Design an enzyme around this catalytic site. Structure first.
Site, PDB file in Angstrom:
ATOM      1  N   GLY A  85     -13.679  79.735 -18.158  1.00  0.00           N
ATOM      2  CA  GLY A  85     -13.645  78.592 -19.078  1.00  0.00           C
ATOM      3  C   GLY A  85     -15.027  78.189 -19.591  1.00  0.00           C
ATOM      4  N   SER A 140      -9.926  82.627 -14.505  1.00  0.00           N
ATOM      5  CA  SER A 140      -9.636  81.235 -14.867  1.00  0.00           C
ATOM      6  C   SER A 140      -8.866  81.186 -16.180  1.00  0.00           C
ATOM      7  CB  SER A 140     -10.972  80.446 -14.870  1.00  0.00           C
ATOM      8  OG  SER A 140     -10.649  79.210 -14.276  1.00  0.00           O
ATOM      9  N   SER A 141      -9.334  80.424 -17.185  1.00  0.00           N
ATOM     10  CA  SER A 141      -8.691  80.474 -18.530  1.00  0.00           C
ATOM     11  C   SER A 141      -8.724  81.903 -19.099  1.00  0.00           C
ATOM     12  CB  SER A 141      -9.346  79.491 -19.473  1.00  0.00           C
ATOM     13  OG  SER A 141     -10.767  79.654 -19.385  1.00  0.00           O
ATOM     14  N   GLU A 163      -7.854  84.428 -10.279  1.00  0.00           N
ATOM     15  CA  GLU A 163      -7.804  82.955 -10.094  1.00  0.00           C
ATOM     16  C   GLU A 163      -7.332  82.259 -11.390  1.00  0.00           C
ATOM     17  OE1 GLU A 163     -11.362  81.481  -7.958  1.00  0.00           O
ATOM     18  OE2 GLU A 163     -10.593  82.527  -6.158  1.00  0.00           O
ATOM     19  N   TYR A 177     -10.026  72.091 -22.086  1.00  0.00           N
ATOM     20  CA  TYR A 177      -9.362  73.108 -21.246  1.00  0.00           C
ATOM     21  C   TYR A 177      -8.435  72.517 -20.187  1.00  0.00           C
ATOM     22  CZ  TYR A 177     -11.835  77.138 -23.269  1.00  0.00           C
ATOM     23  OH  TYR A 177     -12.239  78.177 -24.063  1.00  0.00           O
ATOM     24  N   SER A 218      -6.375  76.672  -3.270  1.00  0.00           N
ATOM     25  CA  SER A 218      -6.776  76.735  -4.706  1.00  0.00           C
ATOM     26  C   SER A 218      -5.870  77.666  -5.499  1.00  0.00           C
ATOM     27  CB  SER A 218      -8.198  77.124  -4.836  1.00  0.00           C
ATOM     28  OG  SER A 218      -9.018  76.138  -4.274  1.00  0.00           O
ATOM     29  N   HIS A 254     -14.982  82.085  -7.375  1.00  0.00           N
ATOM     30  CA  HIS A 254     -14.436  82.088  -8.739  1.00  0.00           C
ATOM     31  C   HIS A 254     -15.215  83.040  -9.652  1.00  0.00           C
ATOM     32  CE1 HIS A 254     -11.535  80.434 -11.383  1.00  0.00           C
ATOM     33  NE2 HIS A 254     -12.496  80.314 -12.339  1.00  0.00           N
TER      34      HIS A 254
HETATM   35  C1  LIG Z   1     -14.770  77.288 -14.905  1.00  0.00           C
HETATM   36  C2  LIG Z   1     -13.592  77.464 -13.930  1.00  0.00           C
HETATM   37  C3  LIG Z   1     -13.907  77.182 -12.429  1.00  0.00           C
HETATM   38  C4  LIG Z   1     -12.645  77.317 -11.515  1.00  0.00           C
HETATM   39  C5  LIG Z   1     -12.824  77.405  -9.989  1.00  0.00           C
HETATM   40  C6  LIG Z   1     -11.560  77.117  -9.149  1.00  0.00           C
HETATM   41  O1  LIG Z   1     -11.850  77.433  -7.782  1.00  0.00           O
HETATM   42  C7  LIG Z   1     -11.316  75.613  -8.927  1.00  0.00           C
HETATM   43  C8  LIG Z   1     -10.403  74.984  -9.929  1.00  0.00           C
HETATM   44  C9  LIG Z   1     -11.211  74.199 -10.938  1.00  0.00           C
HETATM   45  C10 LIG Z   1     -10.432  74.331 -12.211  1.00  0.00           C
HETATM   46  C11 LIG Z   1     -10.673  75.301 -13.072  1.00  0.00           C
HETATM   47  C12 LIG Z   1     -10.008  75.454 -14.371  1.00  0.00           C
HETATM   48  C13 LIG Z   1      -8.926  74.645 -14.567  1.00  0.00           C
HETATM   49  C14 LIG Z   1      -8.281  74.620 -15.751  1.00  0.00           C
HETATM   50  O2  LIG Z   1      -7.214  73.768 -15.781  1.00  0.00           O
HETATM   51  C15 LIG Z   1      -8.706  75.330 -16.839  1.00  0.00           C
HETATM   52  C16 LIG Z   1      -9.810  76.156 -16.681  1.00  0.00           C
HETATM   53  O3  LIG Z   1     -10.232  76.894 -17.692  1.00  0.00           O
HETATM   54  C17 LIG Z   1     -10.499  76.219 -15.475  1.00  0.00           C
HETATM   55  C18 LIG Z   1     -11.728  77.019 -15.470  1.00  0.00           C
HETATM   56  O4  LIG Z   1     -12.000  77.836 -16.376  1.00  0.00           O
HETATM   57  O5  LIG Z   1     -12.539  76.611 -14.474  1.00  0.00           O
END
Ligand SMILES: C[C@H]1CCC[C@@H](O)CCC/C=C/c2cc(O)cc(O)c2C(=O)O1
Ligand SMILES: C[C@H]1CCC[C@@H](O)CCC/C=C/c2cc(O)cc(O)c2C(=O)O1
Lengths: 269, 268
Positions: A32, A102-103, A126, A187, A220, A242
């Protein structure tokens, strides 16, 4: 040997992209925070095994910030997949292996399901399927408060390697600092509901390889392990949390190369 | 209202056990350290909801140390299940809900599979199915070294709550000090290969509820989540890590009560 350039797509985005190597296409979609310098070491290691590796900053983020507001607000996996297809079209990448965290994970699954002719195989890491109120609530804070809080979260909670995370260096962290408010507003409220893993039968038999970080707290991405197992999708671990491409770039590169090689063998068979 | 007593079984074990309450039987099997004072707060909270709760120190551990060498060496899930059935027999517990973590999780799955007429339902937490060479290698060290290493691992790495772990108190930690070498030499080389989860189809449709610690690193019990999902077994999380009954005793007690109530409804 690395191309570092910009390309504009008809949806209004001016992308910053990088490309190295020749051979079958591998595309590394950022998480993200949208920052492709996190792939720098792994891009060279993957390309050296006989692949053309492409990556890019994501719309609104880092060096791809010249983009319409639609592309970085109310962001969904399906919007991101349409953007990624747009740059692959502009770069004449017809068939690609894709990676995303992630995203980016939500994006690569949306790519594989939505554009099956274009995607050889997808590696997802993830993939966020749950809303997190404490994260969503950062969107109402001032820009500098979001940047301070999320810089701290990335280093201390999810980097999987504080020394490697800090060693990204001032230029990268200065770009991330400007991305945190764009990420926070765009996001967390809209990505998790868009997760393309709500239809388990649609995943069954698809060329998908799913990972979670070995050190990530079980809660998580518990749901990713359950979903992948219910779908019969290959699910395993990478070291760290992550950002395995930051924390463990050599292991990350070997995983991407070995998984692409497995699908190239299965494609011929 | 807590009974604190001993009972001798014909396999040679003199057990230290505790019991509180009246109603359907719930049995709390310790983790590999074999120390039942870890359940003290939860035993009262569960019994207060209309259950007879029984727990005990495991053979060779803490106050159940009067036991033959075979009960605490080369330990397997199937040996431990046979020992627990012996104490349930001695206490006239005919039908029991059972809880266990770690080697206790291996025990309660072996109990449900091996003695289905005796087990209403089993709750397993963090069931070890893999050998860990660094843990297995502690067996050849001297007693004081084993105690120092493992005491640190429990406090700083897997307690899921260091303040709650410390608050077990000096007497409990003095018993655990003596248990660490017994556990190291008897459990980690033989418990994982004995895991009663080799046959996924044997688990399907059984009254089993599986948990992992929410804060436990994904890699520790990743295999539990996969196995439970493949078997269609209810799999979820408790707060903390390896000792939810220490770190989060009220949440732990509520989970044991609600799960037992769910299976009492389904039985009827
Ligand atoms: C930058 C990452 C860190 C995730 C770590 C992961 O370990 C902890 C969760 C934090 C959330 C991340 C996340 C959540 C969303 O709803 C949308 C997203 O795009 C993300 C995301 O891209 O987050
Ligand atoms: C005392 C617990 C700690 C579990 C921590 C939990 O995080 C798992 C990491 C340590 C391994 C524990 C273990 C391994 C075995 O092969 C057999 C066992 O009986 C155990 C066990 O009972 O260990």
């Amino acid at each position: 040997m690395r191309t570092r350039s910009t390309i504009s797509t008809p949806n209004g985005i001016t992308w910053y992209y990088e490309q190295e190597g020749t051979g079958p296409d591998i595309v590394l979609v950022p998480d993200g925070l949208g920052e492709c310098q996190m792939f720098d070491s792994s891009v060279s290691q993957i390309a050296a095994q006989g692949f053309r590796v492409t990556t890019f900053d994501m719309p609104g983020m880092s060096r791809s910030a010249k983009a319409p507001a639609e592309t970085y607000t109310e962001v969904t996996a399906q919007k991101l997949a349409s953007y990624v297809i747009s740059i692959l079209d502009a770069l004449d990448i017809k068939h690609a292996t894709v990676w995303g965290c992630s995203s980016g994970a939500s994006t690569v699954v949306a790519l594989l399901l939505g554009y099956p002719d274009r995607i050889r195989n997808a590696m997802c890491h993830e993939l966020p399927t749950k809303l997190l109120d404490h994260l969503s609530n950062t969107a109402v804070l001032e820009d500098e408060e979001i940047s301070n809080i999320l810089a701290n979260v990335m280093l201390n909670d999810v980097s999987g390697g504080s020394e490697a995370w800090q060693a990204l260096g001032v230029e990268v962290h200065a770009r991330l600092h400007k991305n945190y408010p764009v990420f926070a507003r765009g996001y967390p409220r809209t990505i998790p509901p868009s997760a393309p893993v709500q239809d388990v039968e649609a995943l069954r038999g698809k060329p998908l390889d799913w990972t979670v970080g070995a050190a990530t707290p079980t809660e998580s991405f518990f749901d990713n392990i359950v979903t992948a197992t219910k779908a019969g999708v290959n699910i395993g671990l990478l070291p760290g949390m992550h950002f395995p491409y930051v924390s463990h770039p050599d292991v990350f590169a070997k995983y991407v190369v070995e998984t692409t090689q497995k699908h190239l063998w299965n494609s011929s068979s």
